[PDB]
């Protein structure tokens, strides 16, 4: 911006002097703002939003699924804490101004794999009626480095343009785990995008209505520069279901299942040890396969016994039965 003409770089690479045409304020024209200028003689026709480098961040903006709040990854207060950190200050800032606190924006979602940590956040995504932008941590890596610094940065500032949005950082167990220098390895090129994820969260200006979720399979290795309690603030562990919590999940799973009465969901919880609610999500389908061999339109108690026995034996045959992936 030259104070009274502008220096544009065309997408032709060719640099030119342009001015304001027939419908633009000077107020309209910013720095780093794209403009449409007339092909034949270059003069500002129409202002345009900043930066046509984002085009592969237009594959990571996605539209929310329909998942009722009522369906939960387990009935606990644990999703209620998520409802104090993310949900409630979006609907009513009236209470968070009377407290006079600045709402916590960050949260960690952590615990053993498969409890429905993302299931409780998809429920929240139907609910808030605020745009969700979802991120993959191993889609932020490319052959030439510094390409991935650019990608990360543009996505985050686009959420700064928005107001009432949620950036759900998924699968940052690869890029977002703790940095460490090798000394011979190409680990440094990966550590570059880790650093860009730190410097966008804090900014040089604080977050402009960005609620941040971190989906981590592991709490065990995460960066102390993303695990600092000033950008992830209150973090609620969604842990393994209980003997009661597993009955609760299985009551939803068997509610959606056309079944015949006489079942005990309390029993099934006894039979299973502390184990995922994805295990219990596969009791019903494998009970639906024993129904089909017999030719039924319904399932009963019995076919849930066999189904449970099958999933338990496979757990022994493998590892991760209650595992956190060890440590704290």
């Amino acid at each position: 911006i030259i104070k009274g003409k502008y220096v544009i770089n065309l997408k032709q690479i060719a640099k030119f002097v342009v001015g304001l045409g027939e419908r633009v304020r000077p107020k309209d024209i910013e720095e780093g703002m794209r403009v449409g200028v007339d092909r034949s003689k270059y003069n500002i026709e129409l202002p345009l939003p900043p930066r046509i480098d984002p085009s592969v961040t237009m594959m990571t903006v996605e539209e929310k699924p329909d998942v009722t709040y009522s369906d939960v990854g387990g009935c606990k207060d644990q999703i209620e804490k998520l409802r104090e950190v993310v949900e409630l200050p979006l609907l009513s800032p009236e209470r968070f101004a009377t407290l006079g606190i600045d709402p916590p924006k960050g949260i960690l979602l952590y615990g053993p794999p498969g409890t429905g940590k993302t299931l409780c956040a998809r429920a929240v995504a139907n609910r808030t009626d605020a745009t969700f932008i979802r991120v993959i941590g191993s889609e932020l890596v490319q052959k030439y480095v510094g390409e991935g610094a650019r990608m990360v940065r543009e996505l985050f500032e686009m959420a700064r343009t928005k107001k009432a949005c949620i950036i759900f950082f998924d699968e940052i167990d690869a890029v977002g785990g703790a940095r460490f220098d090798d000394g011979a390895g190409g680990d440094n090129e990966v550590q570059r995008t880790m650093l860009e994820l730190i410097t966008q969260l804090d900014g040089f200006d604080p977050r402009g209505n960005i609620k941040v979720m971190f989906a981590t399979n592991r709490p065990n290795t995460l960066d102390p520069a993303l695990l600092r309690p000033g950008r992830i603030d209150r973090k609620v562990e969604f842990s393994l279901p209980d003997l009661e919590g597993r009955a609760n999940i299985f009551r939803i799973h068997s509610k959606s299942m056309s079944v015949e009465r006489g079942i005990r969901w309390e029993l099934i919880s006894r039979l299973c040890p502390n184990s995922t609610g994805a295990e219990l999500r596969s009791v019903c389908t494998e009970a639906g396969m024993f129904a089909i061999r017999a030719r039924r339109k319904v399932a009963t108690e019995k076919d849930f016994l066999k189904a449970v026995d099958k999933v338990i034996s496979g757990y022994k045959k493998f590892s991760s039965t209650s595992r956190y992936m060890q440590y704290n």
Partner: peptide, 21 residues
């Protein structure tokens, strides 16, 4: 903000692309 993206211990870097960084 952050000095570690350029500030590396290394500056003899054998067989990696840290020579562009």
């Amino acid at each position: 903000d952050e000095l570690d993206a350029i500030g590396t211990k290394r500056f003899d870097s054998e067989k990696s692309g840290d020579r562009e960084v």
